[PDB]
Paper text:
In humans, closely related RNA helicases, [name] and [name], shape selective mRNA export pathways through the formation of distinct complexes, known as apo-TREX and apo-AREX complexes, and their subsequent remodeling into similar ATP-bound complexes. In mammals, [name] has a paralogue that is 90% identical to URH4914 (also called [name]). [name] forms the apo-TREX complex, and [name] forms the apo-Alternative-mRNA-EXport (AREX) complex. Each helicase selectively exports a distinct subset of mRNAs, including key mitotic regulators.
The folds of two N- and C-domains in [name]ΔN41 are essentially the same as the apo-[name]ΔN42 structure. However, the N- and C-domains of [name]ΔN41 were located in distinct positions from the respective domains of [name]ΔN42. The crystal of [name]ΔN41 contained SO42− and polyethylene glycol (PEG) around the interspace between N- and C-domains and the ATP-binding pocket. First, although the amino acid sequence of the linker is the same in both helicases, the linker of [name] did not have any secondary structure, while this region of [name] showed a clearly oriented α-helical structure. Second, the relative orientation of the N- and C-domains differed between the apo-[name]ΔN42 and the apo-[name]ΔN41. In addition, [name] M243 and [name] M242 on each loop were directly interacted with [name]-V224 and [name]-C223, respectively. Although the amino acid sequences constituting the C-domain loop are identical in [name] and [name], the C-domain loop of [name] covers its own ATP-binding pocket. While a more precise understanding of the differences between [name] and [name] requires their ATP-binding affinity analysis, our results imply that the [name] C-domain loop likely gives [name] less affinity for ATP in the apo-state, allowing it to maintain a different conformation from the apo-state of [name]. Although several DEAD-box proteins inhibit their ATP binding by intramolecular interactions, the arrangement of the loop in the C-domain is not observed among other DEAD-box proteins, suggesting that [name] has evolutionarily acquired a unique structure to repress ATP binding. The crystal structure of [name] and [name] in apo-state showed the distinct configuration of the N- and C-domain, probably due to different linker structures.
Author numbering: 13 to 388
């Protein structure tokens, strides 16, 4: 419905349907209308906000495939994200058979990559900058037809001066007349001027800037609990906080499955989603949480990659987040629109307490020690 208002090709609309998406995310409303007009884009958005689909959809909307011509180049820092982005291109081009996507992150030898490039002639190339640069240096393909140049994890790529030089050398070999879009889950204030030097009057979106402002309105508590005390305290808190939608973040896939199982055995309506599950399964489980029976989602980081995860009432850090960016991104979903949110963090050791202090220091908020009397 709302995607139709973007004026996307019917082939893209049909693929968006098949992917189970109902309406555009907030980041998509902000970015897609101008991205499909060729405007440069600088966008920071955390996982699970529809960020990847902004550039996949906008570049597929504009692409005019010519055999032998790479017209879309997408690069990122990690092999796994390059692989996952290539799969997102496959899902959204389901009804665009003329579009060919290939990915190059080092999984094959450089000679095998050269063979794939010459045989398959992709119009969309995804990869990491080291391998892309080596392939162009060896004349395995040409960058002279690139019309869309996209970076993801762009802060990782441009911080590391090694990769920044490779990115610039690749940028130099593309036409000056091109659309440039850069995405990242995090964008420090220091890295934004660097990104801007590659662009022309870009539209800019920084989700975390807004999240850092609303954070003072979020009720945030911690509980000092070693591991062996976490379940009893959690079970007790979940009893008093009934009729709320809750996400519980844990640090690993097996802790995710086990906690959700223990919760279900304890008669809580919980479901597990971790970042290793396939998209179709993550979507199916997430629909149960957002629309139907499940009130508690046990999750790892990145459980909602490629999806649009709505706000909830309460967020638990059952296991401490690894840094303060991760804390911010986890608790940002606490508080449904126009209501009060609650974040509760389990602190088990001194390293945990260190992170909580960096959190309170960086975002200028107080994470109070949770009381031990009635919650009103």
């Amino acid at each position: 419905s709302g995607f139709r208002d973007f004026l996307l090709k019917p082939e893209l609309l049909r693929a968006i349907v098949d992917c189970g998406f109902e309406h555009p995310s907030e980041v998509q409303h902000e970015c897609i209308p101008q991205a499909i007009l060729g405007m440069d884009v600088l966008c920071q958005a955390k996982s699970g906000m529809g960020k990847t689909a902004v550039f996949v959809l906008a570049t597929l909307q504009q692409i005019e495939p010519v055999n032998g011509q790479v017209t879309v180049l997408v690069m990122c820092h990690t092999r796994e994200l390059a692989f996952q982005i290539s799969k997102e291109y496959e899902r959204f081009s389901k009804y665009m058979p003329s579009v060919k996507v290939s990915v190059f992150f080092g999984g094959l030898s450089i000679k095998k990559d050269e063979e794939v490039l010459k045989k398959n002639c992709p119009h969309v190339v995804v990869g990491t900058p080291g391998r892309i640069l080596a392939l162009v240096r060896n004349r395995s393909f040409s960058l002279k037809n690139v019309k869309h140049f996209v970076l993801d994890e762009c802060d990782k790529m441009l911080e590391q001066l090694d990769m920044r030089r490779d990115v610039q050398e690749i940028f130099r070999l593309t036409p000056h007349e091109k659309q440039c879009m850069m995405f990242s889950a995090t964008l420090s204030k220091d890295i934004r001027p660097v990104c801007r030097k590659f662009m022309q009057d870009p539209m800019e979106v920084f989700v975390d800037d807004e999240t850092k402002l609303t954070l003072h309105g979020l009720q945030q508590y911690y509980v000092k609990l070693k591991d062996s005390e976490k379940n009893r305290k959690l079970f007790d808190l979940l009893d008093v906080l009934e009729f709320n939608q809750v996400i519980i973040f844990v640090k690993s896939v097996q802790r995710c499955m086990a906690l959700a199982q223990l919760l279900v055995e304890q008669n809580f309506p919980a479901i597990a989603i971790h970042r290793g599950m396939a998209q179709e399964e993550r979507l199916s489980r997430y629909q149960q949480f957002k629309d139907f029976q499940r009130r508690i989602l046990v999750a790892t980081n990145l459980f909602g990659r490629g999806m649009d995860i709505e706000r909830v009432n309460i967020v638990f850090n059952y296991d401490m987040p690894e840094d303060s960016d991760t804390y911010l991104h986890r608790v940002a979903r606490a508080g449904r629109f126009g209501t009060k949110g609650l974040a509760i963090t389990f602190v088990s050791d001194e390293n945990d307490a260190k992170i909580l202090n960096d959190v309170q220091d960086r975002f200028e908020v107080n994470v109070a020690e949770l009381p031990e009397e009635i919650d009103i």
